[PDB]
Design a protein around this ligand. Structure first.
Ligand SMILES: Nc1ncnc2c1ncn2[C@@H]1O[C@H](COP(=O)(O)OP(=O)(O)OP(=O)(O)O)[C@@H](O)[C@H]1O
Ligand SMILES: Nc1ncnc2c1ncn2[C@@H]1O[C@H](COP(=O)(O)OP(=O)(O)OP(=O)(O)O)[C@@H](O)[C@H]1O
Ligand SMILES: [Mg+2]
Ligand SMILES: [Mg+2]
Ligand code: NI
Lengths: 254, 254
């Protein structure tokens, strides 16, 4: 990879993408996968378990390469880009959020290519709803995260993991079930941050969630079944269709 | 990956490692690959073309995972470590050294997790022998690298690529033919930096070279043939053996 463009729109395109994990070569996780993630819009990726949603997120971070087809970022293949440049443009928060044993300010800074001020760290923690519980500590942001493995709450962990990606100011934000542990209060904080903010109105967001309520408000929804796009479009468009998306939502609480 | 130990010795172990590129599943590039990279020692990896030397370097950066066996860093599997933590501990320079279109000081800083001073940037460039030609520019270190693709010399590119990894201060330095373009003058600069320096006397170095002259002075030599360790040991030990290493060196200029 050589590409490090100073201006990235954030357009993501999957073109006939097929993938199988290198340890399971012929078990097609993805097959003929085609969609487009538009910059400034939040696209929700939903579907049944084992469909390939997290696999899609892995391919977007160039953790794996597609066996067939192309994963395109701003027109060029993802492999053409510099690895560390991708880290500066693409950030992903997950329901697989592993802290360290270091201070909270070190956990938030993470792989940042600079030294962030306290005003900067407090800001992203406030937007992620992690500032309050951190400020309650005697050592504050210098408090080393517990090596206990459960020294912290579920949502309080995700709040730290969220702020970690916010401070990166990525062009592409991938949320892999990183909203499940958050309460509706902190949920709205994220939603308003992604929807009702001028900062995140220029960036593309991939919201992977099992919570159809969150996908309901998304600008675009990708329904994934058997490793392929079963349906596509907004909530209303998918609703009147009365197919995969609708049937899945049909069985819910009104 | 969760591991981010504040103290890393740098011990690298390959244990019965077998690998095949995910696009070519049953073409065994590596098979029963076992060796140990000792901290504070420079280990040279040599062998015929297509043996798997660069593949080994790829596995060490966790770019790929072994289909069989284990790649161990300081006792724990490489996948157990945090991805961005690995970037802070493991740095690799290659004969595949792609610059950008940004300033020389930005190319050297690269993926650094902080903001480096000019004293710091000049130091690594001086040690890599890149300070002189950069200082000759009117804009100095702020000179944007040419988008021409050949605006710079071969060795002058490698000198910049070398300093990029030096400033990272990695526990594991991987040199994938990153010495071929350097003259014997700049060669000695690297050699003295790796051998005759207190800074690099505590770190492990993997020197991948086709230049047997460089491997001759290494603390340890790994001969790779058909994806496996044919022979092992220092220069003299491999010499008296009179096998793979010796025979390859037997045909040379005395
Ligand atoms: N590391 C891996 N190695 C091999 N196979 C895997 C790996 N990770 C996932 N798979 C397989 O790939 C399929 C897709 O998994 P993926 O995690 O993308 O599904 P998902 O849509 O995230 O599921 P859920 O909706 O339950 O989170 C799964 O059936 C799983 O068995
Ligand atoms: N990206 C790739 N995809 C598929 N196969 C590959 C890839 N890279 C290398 N190979 C194959 O793996 C084998 C090992 O390649 P590798 O680059 O490790 O050899 P090497 O020891 O670096 O060779 P040389 O000494 O000529 O540099 C080669 O025969 C090559 O055909
Ligand atoms: Mg999953
Ligand atoms: Mg090679
Ligand atoms: Ni990386």
């Amino acid at each position: 990879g050589s590409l490090a463009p100073l201006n990235m729109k954030g357009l993501v395109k999957f073109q006939d993408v097929s993938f199988a994990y290198p340890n399971h070569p012929n078990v097609q996780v993805l097959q003929g996968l085609t969609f487009t993630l538009y910059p400034g819009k939040v696209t929700a990726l939903v579907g049944p378990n084992g469909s390939g949603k997290s696999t899609v997120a892995a391919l977007l971070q160039n953790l794996y390469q597609p066996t067939g087809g192309k994963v395109l970022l701003d027109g060029e293949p993802l492999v053409q880009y510099d690895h560390h440049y991708l880290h500066t443009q693409v950030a992903a928060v997950g329901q697989e959020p592993l802290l360290f044993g270091r201070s909270f300010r070190e956990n938030i800074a993470y792989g940042l290519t600079r030294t962030p001020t306290m005003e900067e760290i407090t800001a992203v923690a406030m937007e992620s709803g992690a500032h309050d519980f951190i400020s309650g500590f005697p050592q504050g942001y210098d408090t080393e995260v517990g090596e206990t493995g459960n020294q912290l709450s579920g949502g309080q962990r995700q709040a730290v993991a969220l702020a970690r990606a916010l401070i990166r100011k990525p062009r592409l934000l991938i949320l892999d079930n990183a909203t499940s542990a958050l309460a509706a209060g902190n949920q709205l904080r994220v939603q308003r941050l992604l929807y009702e903010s001028p900062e995140w109105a220029s960036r593309t967001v991939l919201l992977i969630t099992q919570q159809l309520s969150l996908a309901e408000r998304a600008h675009h929804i990708l329904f994934l079944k058997e490793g392929s796009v079963c349906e596509q479009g907004t909530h209303l468009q998918l609703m009147e269709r009365g197919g995969c998306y609708r049937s899945m939502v049909e069985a819910l609480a009104a």
